[PDB]
From a paper:
EPCR is a transmembrane MHC class I-like glycoprotein primarily abundant in the vasculature of large vessels, but present in numerous cell types. Since its identification, EPCR has been mainly known for its role in accelerating the generation of the anticoagulant activated protein C (APC) and favoring its cytoprotective properties. Structurally, EPCR shares a notable degree of homology with the CD1 family of receptors, including the presence of a central and extended hydrophobic cavity suitable for lipid antigens, flanked by two alpha helices lying on top of a beta sheet. The presence of a lipid bound to EPCR is key for its biological functions.
In the delipidated EPCR structure, the electron density for the Arg156 side chain is absent, which suggests high flexibility (elevated B-factors) and conformational disorder.
Author numbering: 9 to 105, 108 to 177
The structure:
């Protein structure tokens, strides 16, 4: 009983991005993300959520993408960051038949970059390369409740409750 979410972001430059993503519930594809930042398709393949509730979830995902893009632009603006690049975000929750296991792992240009430590709602480097980019990204992720305790709540409560409601 799990929900997994995958987001791949292709940045031609800091300001133009193409998204490709999907989610699966119990190992079955349930959602698809596709399109440029200006017009991104976000679809549930199965009518799991009622329309008013889905429109709420769709809106939240759109706002996430805008904040994600904002952070990538800020890293570019403050550190040396070379484009084009790809970012992979892999996150979700898994319910043992006890405590849920949740995760959020980020790769850049196919290499491990940062990941979320839910035990303390903190981000760590997954690379051994000491890097102004990695250091600056961590400083931003670890400075805001949105990417700390609020993200832990999304993974530990929202995603788990989605699995509990729909598997
Ligand atoms: C240069 C690589 C960037 C890696 C970005 C990781 C994104 C993790 C979630 C970010 C979206 C939440 C809002 C961020 C607000 C600062
Ligand atoms: C997303 O789709 C890709 C394409 O096959 C697949 O490899 C991956 O497992 C999927 N992930 C999720 C969370 O649905
Ligand atoms: C946005 O994308 C959808 C799906 O590709 C398309 O139907 C719609 O016309 C697009 N809107 C534009 C290009 O303004
Ligand atoms: C990512 O890879 C592309 C080509 O593979 C390169 O042009 C770009 O500079 C790379 N960016 C980073 C941050 O490694
Ligand atoms: C359709 C799946 C899109 C990728 C997952 C986005 C998760 C954002 C969590 C805040
Ligand atoms: C793609 C989002 C699925 C639902 C997350 C609670």
């Amino acid at each position: 009983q799990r929900l997994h979410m995958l987001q791949i972001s292709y940045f031609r430059d800091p300001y133009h991005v193409w998204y490709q993503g999907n989610a699966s519930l119990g190992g079955h594809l349930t959602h698809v993300l596709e399109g440029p930042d200006t017009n991104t398709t976000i679809i549930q393949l199965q009518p799991l959520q009622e329309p008013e509730s889905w429109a709420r979830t769709q809106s939240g995902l759109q706002s996430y993408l805008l904040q994600f893009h904002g952070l990538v632009r800020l890293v570019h603006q403050e550190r040396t960051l070379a484009f084009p690049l790809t970012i992979r975000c892999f996150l979700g929750c898994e319910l043992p038949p006890s405590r849920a296991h949740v995760f959020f792992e980020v790769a850049v240009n196919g290499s491990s970059f940062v990941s979320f430590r839910p035990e303390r709602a903190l981000w760590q480097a997954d690379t051994q390369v000491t890097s102004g980019v990695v250091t600056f990204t961590l400083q931003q992720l670890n400075a805001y409740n949105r990417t700390r305790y609020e993200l832990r709540e999304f993974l530990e409560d929202t995603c788990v409750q989605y699995v509990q409601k729909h598997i």
